[PDB]
Symmetry: D2
Subunit: 114 residues, 4 copies
Amino acid sequence: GEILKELPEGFDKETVRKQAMEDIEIAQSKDYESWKSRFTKDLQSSLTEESYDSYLKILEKQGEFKEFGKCTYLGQIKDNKKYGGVIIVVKYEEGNVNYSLAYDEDMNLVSFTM
Amino acid sequence: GEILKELPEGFDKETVRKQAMEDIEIAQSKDYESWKSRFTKDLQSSLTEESYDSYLKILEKQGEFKEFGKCTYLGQIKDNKKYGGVIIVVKYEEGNVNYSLAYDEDMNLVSFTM
Amino acid sequence: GEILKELPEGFDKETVRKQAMEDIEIAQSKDYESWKSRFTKDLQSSLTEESYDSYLKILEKQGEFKEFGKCTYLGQIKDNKKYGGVIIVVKYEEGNVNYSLAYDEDMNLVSFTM
Amino acid sequence: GEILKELPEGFDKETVRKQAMEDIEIAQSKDYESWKSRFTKDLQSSLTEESYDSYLKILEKQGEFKEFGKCTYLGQIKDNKKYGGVIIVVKYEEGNVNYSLAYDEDMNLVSFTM
Ligand SMILES: [Cl-]
Ligand SMILES: [Cl-]
Ligand SMILES: [Cl-]
Ligand SMILES: [Cl-]
Ligand SMILES: [Cl-]
Ligand SMILES: [Cl-]
Ligand SMILES: [Cl-]
Ligand SMILES: [Cl-]
Ligand SMILES: [Cl-]
Ligand SMILES: [Cl-]
Ligand SMILES: [Cl-]
Ligand SMILES: [Cl-]
């Protein structure tokens, strides 16, 4: 495998930033089924509502969403497949939070971490 | 804050790689209290044995430890404090696993992810 | 000193990209004095018209400017001062050329390489 | 094409660091023909003794070689071929100098800059 300090081939910054902002808004909506639907078909059945509700508990403590900040792009080659990652700053009333999201080439989530 | 694509000042690759290999060996030992003791004093009380046992469940499915592989170094500046990170390949009988570890300047864990 | 795999603090990607494209256009204009004036005061005396004319000779062999491509951002800390760098793709009729430009915090050139 | 913030596949850090230090020592030896011979066959005809002697003039002003410092690894994909790069610190009596060297997969120089 490989860890990349930029996006892999086939990914582009603007598409990744735009999808990450939409996917964080879907996570903040508290709609578990819409958030689950943003993951690759093969990983959806690996997700739980309990784990999502634990994220919502921590999320509520941040206060109101204020703005999106800077993006840091990364990548990974795992089992000859490419994954594009982004560390995006989300500014809440109680402070800045760094989200880590990763996508497959079809732009569906493989990972989502607050 | 800042996301860095190398270690911050005050960290060095050899020290970080050596500590990451020791800390992954302590995690594989199944000794929860020794593993907990490797985290910064302020984060120890945030850890649970249940979360560590969930890691041990996933770890057991990998088979026997075979070797350490390549290291990828990263960093973060959060609330004017520096954190050194490493993505290290751990080769098990069932395949390669990428661990993500982060340290404070005193070389105690702030994050540990399989 | 430090070589960084991102811009240092005080530099912004969008500002760097705009200045790099402007500065490469000034270099392509064949106006030596305007190009020289884009460098920090301390480095102006170090530049020669002969060296700039050698660049123009190599530049003419590329054909017509077609487009700017992708940017790769880097940085450097040298004698406690911060320098923001960019590797920018310049697409000419005869092919792609990677320019390396570096700036001081006042957004004046410290380095320019075709 | 691609600019990478790590070595491409097929390159190893330790091999690159050893070759870069060897190649900088050959450059410092003032042996033009040995230095030229370290470049890929296609690029040898492009080198001049005059350009190498200009480097030797600047090199002599640095004083005695003291030590090699840190390495920063980069890469490039150009016309579907992979190139591994290193920015290596060379500490001279008069101060630190950052050399930029790039290699093809056969570990022959494609670029050498002081
Ligand atoms: Cl691409
Ligand atoms: Cl892009
Ligand atoms: Cl340091
Ligand atoms: Cl180091
Ligand atoms: Cl900044
Ligand atoms: Cl920026
Ligand atoms: Cl002149
Ligand atoms: Cl080039
Ligand atoms: Cl490899
Ligand atoms: Cl390596
Ligand atoms: Cl000659
Ligand atoms: Cl330098």
